[PDB]
């Protein structure tokens, strides 16, 4: 199994962009999708200030040059986890996008949780699911806030369970405990559709790449 | 299982320390990926603070030179009766045409705010746009 | 390559300046009985009432004229350190865009 590991699981980690996620987006695309639009200066969170380009007439503008790098890192991580056959769970309590997120999760062969988050799903999964249940290996937050503008309980729960998290963080969100935060607009439908498209594409490409690599290895 | 102290270090540091200490038999699936491609900031919990006294946010207001011109336009000719179409990425308002003409005359002429304003208005009427003060 | 600063500088939303009393073109994308959700290119949609005149013409995909009042409705209440947002824009529906 040493040869299997060294050629399949360790080889992708030696390349900067093994799945070519840099070509899935550009700053022009993010601008067209209105990813740079943030909330008012009054709703600003302190920890989001380093990601804010400025305030245009009291409206925060997100710096898309930073969004590009953060999104590159997040997409690369998501692709690598999909390559390793890890369980990926999307989470969002924005009801405007629940149907879209569940459809996207069904399409890429991953999991979604867009409904009410019951206490202990992660920290007490063993009682609520069974003694042998396998928890997610990665959790992607398309909206980190619940409907009260307080952080989703899943952020802290996944931090407790040592599960990495990707997260779309708007100017009023708290990015401290998200492993791979992506500053961006999480309200306009164009931006959310772009995020769903990108993550679906990355996961699908990673899975196809894994199958191709395994087939080639078996052949040779 | 790992440590559930989400406020001490980050998931990476906790998992790495437990792995070296022999508590965890095997690294989790994500550990190698994190080590190879870490985030720009280590995800460490921090408590947000309220600023007091002279401390101020470093967020600047986004202003441009042409804004000044725009202000005068919106104060003299008023908001254009034409509607903005923000969906078109290359939309040009009447104010934007006035700003472009103003900068053109300024670069091809002298610098006198009122003279540039009146000459630019005269020109824009010459191309044939209505401008009701 | 165009930098983000140039894109922001030449953006129509930036060119608009203040949003108070500006005429914009919005598109209806969702209807609930007599309630029209209109996107005009900002961060948030605006929720308007179906006018009593020619109300049948206001259907999904319809182009309407709006007079903006505020791009996002927020307000600070007593004993609060952060603004509360309704996640909505304020606009006045004028009519159909011919």
């Amino acid at each position: 199994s040493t040869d299997f590991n060294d050629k399949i699981l360790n080889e992708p980690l030696k390349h900067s962009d093994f799945f070519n996620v840099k070509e899935l987006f550009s700053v022009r695309s993010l601008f067209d999708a209105r990813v740079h639009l943030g909330h008012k200066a009054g709703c600003r969170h302190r920890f989001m200030e380093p990601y804010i380009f400025g305030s245009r007439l009291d409206h925060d503008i997100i710096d898309l040059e930073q969004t590009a790098t953060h999104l590159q890192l997040a997409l690369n991580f998501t692709a690598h986890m999909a390559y390793r056959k890890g369980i990926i769970l999307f989470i969002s309590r924005n009801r405007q996008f629940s149907y879209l997120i569940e459809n996207m999760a069904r399409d890429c062969g991953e999991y979604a949780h867009t409904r009410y988050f019951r206490g202990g799903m992660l920290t007490n999964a063993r009682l609520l699911f069974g003694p042998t249940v396998r928890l997610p290996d990665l959790i992607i937050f398309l909206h980190t806030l619940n409907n009260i503008f307080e952080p989703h309980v899943a952020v802290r729960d996944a931090a407790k369970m040592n599960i990495p998290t990707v997260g779309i963080v708007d100017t009023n969100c708290n990015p401290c405990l998200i492993t791979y935060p992506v500053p961006g607009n999480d309200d306009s439908p164009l931006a959310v559709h772009l995020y769903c498209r990108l993550f679906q594409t990355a996961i699908t490409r990673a899975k196809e790449k894994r199958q191709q690599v395994e087939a080639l290895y078996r052949l040779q | 299982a790992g440590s559930r102290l989400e406020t001490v270090g980050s998931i990476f540091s906790r998992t790495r320390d437990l792995v070296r200490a022999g508590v965890l038999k095997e690294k989790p699936l994500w550990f190698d990926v994190y080590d190879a491609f870490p985030p720009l900031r280590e995800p460490v919990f921090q408590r947000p603070r309220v600023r007091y006294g002279k401390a101020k946010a470093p967020i600047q207001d986004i202003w441009y030179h042409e804004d000044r011109i725009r202000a005068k336009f919106y104060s003299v000719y008023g908001s254009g009766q034409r509607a903005f179409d923000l969906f078109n990425p290359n939309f040009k308002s009447t104010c934007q045409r006035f700003v472009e003409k103003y900068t053109e005359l300024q670069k091809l002429g002298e610098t006198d705010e009122e003279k540039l304003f009146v000459e630019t208005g005269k020109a824009l009427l010459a191309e044939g746009v209505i401008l009701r003060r | 390559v165009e930098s983000f600063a140039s894109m922001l500088r030449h953006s129509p939303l930036t060119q608009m300046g203040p949003a108070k009393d500006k005429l914009v073109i919005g598109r209806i994308f969702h209807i609930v009985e007599n309630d029209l959700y209109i996107d005009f290119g900002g961060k948030f949609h605006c929720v308007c009432r179906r006018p009593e005149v020619d109300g049948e013409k206001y259907q999904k995909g319809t182009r309407v004229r709006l007079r903006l009042l505020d791009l996002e409705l927020t307000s600070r209440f007593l004993g609060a350190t952060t603004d509360t947002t309704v996640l909505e824009a304020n606009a006045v529906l004028l009519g159909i865009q011919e």
Binding site: G54, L57 | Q60, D61, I62, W63, Y64, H65, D67, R68, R70, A71, Y74, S75 | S3, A5, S6, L8, R9, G17, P18
Partner: peptide, 25 residues
Amino acid sequence: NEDLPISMENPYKEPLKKCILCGKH
């Protein structure tokens, strides 16, 4: 790069309205 924002006072501010008797004795 010339496209960065510059520092200035808010140009979109209406100069304070003068009362009807301003400048009159």
